[PDB]
Design an enzyme around this catalytic site. Structure first.
Site, PDB file in Angstrom:
ATOM      1  N   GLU A  27       0.758  -1.063   0.063  1.00 19.03           N
ATOM      2  CA  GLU A  27      -0.022   0.186  -0.119  1.00 19.03           C
ATOM      3  C   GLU A  27       0.861   1.296  -0.088  1.00 19.03           C
ATOM      4  O   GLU A  27       1.716   1.660   0.928  1.00 19.03           O
ATOM      5  CB  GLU A  27      -0.912  -0.062   1.247  1.00 19.03           C
ATOM      6  CG  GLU A  27      -2.213  -0.897   1.150  1.00 19.03           C
ATOM      7  CD  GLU A  27      -2.909  -0.409  -0.038  1.00 19.03           C
ATOM      8  OE1 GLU A  27      -3.021   0.893  -0.328  1.00 19.03           O
ATOM      9  OE2 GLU A  27      -3.754  -1.071  -0.693  1.00 19.03           O
ATOM     10  N   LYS A  84      -2.886   1.019  12.084  1.00 16.31           N
ATOM     11  CA  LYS A  84      -2.398   2.412  11.244  1.00 16.31           C
ATOM     12  C   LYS A  84      -2.815   3.252  12.460  1.00 16.31           C
ATOM     13  O   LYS A  84      -1.848   4.258  12.926  1.00 16.31           O
ATOM     14  CB  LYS A  84      -3.029   2.678  10.105  1.00 16.31           C
ATOM     15  N   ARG A 113      -3.369 -13.150   9.944  1.00 20.01           N
ATOM     16  CA  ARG A 113      -2.510 -11.801  10.514  1.00 20.01           C
ATOM     17  C   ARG A 113      -1.425 -12.180  11.454  1.00 20.01           C
ATOM     18  O   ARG A 113      -1.827 -12.941  12.419  1.00 20.01           O
ATOM     19  CB  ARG A 113      -3.579 -10.783  10.764  1.00 20.01           C
TER      20      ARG A 113
END
Length: 523
Positions: free
Chosen positions: A27, A262, A252
């Site tokens: 990203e 984030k 994850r």
């Protein structure tokens, strides 16, 4: 040994696939942390194993690229030891095909232009509980939609006044299958095509198409994207495309004493709770590097976290890989962190140089370390009195200075406050255990002792990414080290006798070298 490699084995024999083609969709919105390492490791690792390929596709679909992340991510990836197939791919590359593939769905009566407001669409979609409803525009003609979609692309519609949605099932047990938007309007110069386009594809629609076009054989995503797989296959099964990549999910990474978000992170950085993103306390790859962690170390780590249980990785696992790695390759050296003045009264002459290994286990040779009668030791290593356990320099006893001679505690001076100001003691004619360093020949060094970022095992599932941070995640102390630590190159580590593993801080030099404490001894 994982189910994925076993599934790839399958589509290799029976024939479903010939080679293997994977990819890593990061990203261009942020920096790679240790969680990305897992996906990086599965996608590239798996690709070099079956002598195959893995691509690197950034998503610049969002018309603020902030050219730095892409270069920052590429660098972080090669450092790990992986190489991406062909050029760095970009979703914005596929706009034409995306646009045409959407028309195809429109022609099959499998997509339509909706003029319900984003707020209406939000309500009509229902919930896991209340069923959804069809837009009153859902059963529009193939020709009307075709026309309304070109109007959109030509800019005839105001933003939000129209969007193109997939026509699937509004009663679906998966909210993403309830007529997900494929296109939206955005009057704002992209940056790769500026004003060429007026409409854009949604992630899901774009992600699956790109893979197909890229010849992706196996598309790996974390568990949170398992529902998306339904839209993914839906779109692929319905457009005319050669190969149909399958999505397989992995879990994850859940690393204890660290947050994987984030919101969480972004706060930290923006609060001086860390010296930015590459900070040694951060879970970012760049940050682990400045910490002293090695590429080989993270890779070997990747092997324990996924090669199914109460899968919540403890820091000891990551710690273990690096300690163990620097334990075999980091030359040895000495340094005092809590310097207290030790002086031998019966030390004859000025000074000499002793022989000190480069590693106890030495094809690594040696080096001459100065030894005078005025030496610096850690004050943790002295005690006027202690029981039998104490393994160091007592008041009427002694110990052996590493690769040096034996001492003998004699006199000890204090100050007005109480804290000692200079130990006194004698030594032996010759004996040629604690670390030490010559006072005259010494480097005034800065020592930054880090530690776990949070006081709780799981800062994530915790209340707030703040009121639970380790107050003393860093404590800077001025210590004395041997001259040898003057050549020490950047990024390279050394084991400082009885203190831990350290490396020169890349940010802070010449007259004042800064050493970051990577990890400690297993002892």
């Amino acid at each position: 040994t994982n189910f994925i490699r076993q599934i790839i084995d399958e589509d290799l024999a029976s024939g479903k696939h010939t080679t293997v083609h994977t990819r890593f969709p990061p990203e261009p919105n942020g920096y790679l942390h240790i969680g990305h390492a897992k996906s990086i490791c599965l996608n590239f690792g798996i690709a070099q194993d079956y002598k195959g390929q893995c691509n690197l596709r950034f998503d610049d679909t969002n018309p603020k690229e902030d050219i730095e992340y892409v270069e920052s991510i590429k660098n972080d990836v090669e450092w790990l030891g992986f190489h991406w197939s062909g050029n760095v791919r970009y979703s914005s590359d596929y706009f034409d095909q995306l646009h045409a593939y959407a028309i195809e769905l429109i022609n099959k009566g499998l997509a339509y232009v909706d003029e319900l407001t984003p707020e209406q669409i939000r309500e009509y979609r229902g919930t896991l509980t209340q069923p959804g409803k069809n837009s009153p525009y859902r059963d529009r003609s193939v020709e009307e939609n075709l026309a309304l979609f070109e109007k959109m692309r030509a800019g005839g519609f105001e933003e939000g006044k129209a969007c193109l949605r997939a026509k699937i099932d509004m009663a679906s047990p998966f909210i993403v299958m309830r007529d997900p938007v494929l296109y939206r309007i955005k009057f704002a110069e992209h940056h790769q095509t500026g004003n060429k386009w007026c409409i854009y594809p949604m992630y899901d629609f774009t992600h699956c198409i790109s893979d197909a076009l890229e010849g992706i054989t196996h598309s790996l995503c974390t568990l949170e994207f398992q529902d998306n797989r339904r839209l993914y296959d839906w779109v692929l099964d319905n457009i005319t495309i050669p190969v149909h990549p399958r999505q397989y999910e992995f879990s994850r990474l859940n690393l204890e004493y660290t947050v994987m978000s984030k919101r969480k992170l972004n706060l930290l950085v923006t609060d001086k709770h860390v010296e930015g993103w590459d900070d040694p306390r951060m879970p970012t790859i760049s940050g682990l590097r400045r910490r002293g962690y090695t590429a080989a170390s993270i890779r070997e780590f990747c092997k324990r976290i996924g090669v199914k249980q109460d899968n919540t990785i403890e820091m000891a696992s990551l710690e273990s890989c690096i300690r163990e790695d620097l334990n075999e390759n980091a030359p040895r050296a000495m340094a005092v962190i809590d310097p207290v003045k030790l002086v031998i009264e019966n030390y004859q002459g000025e000074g000499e140089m002793v022989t000190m290994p480069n590693h106890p286990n030495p094809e690594m040779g040696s080096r001459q370390v100065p030894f005078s009668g005025e030496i610096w030791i850690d004050r943790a290593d002295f005690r006027e009195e202690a029981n039998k356990q104490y393994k160091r320099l007592v008041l009427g006893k002694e110990v052996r200075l590493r690769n040096a001679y034996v001492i003998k505690a004699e006199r000890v001076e204090k100050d007005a406050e109480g804290n000692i100001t200079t130990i006194f003691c004698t030594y032996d004619a010759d004996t040629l255990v604690i670390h030490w360093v010559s006072a005259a020949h010494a480097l005034p060094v800065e020592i930054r002792l880090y530690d776990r970022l949070f006081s709780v095992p799981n800062p994530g599932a915790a209340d707030d990414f703040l009121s639970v941070i380790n107050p003393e995640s860093l404590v800077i102390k001025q210590g004395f080290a041997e001259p040898s630590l003057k050549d020490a190159v950047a990024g390279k580590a050394f084991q400082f006798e009885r203190e831990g593993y350290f490396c020169l801080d890349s940010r802070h030099t010449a007259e004042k070298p800064v050493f970051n404490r990577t990890v400690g001894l297993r002892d």
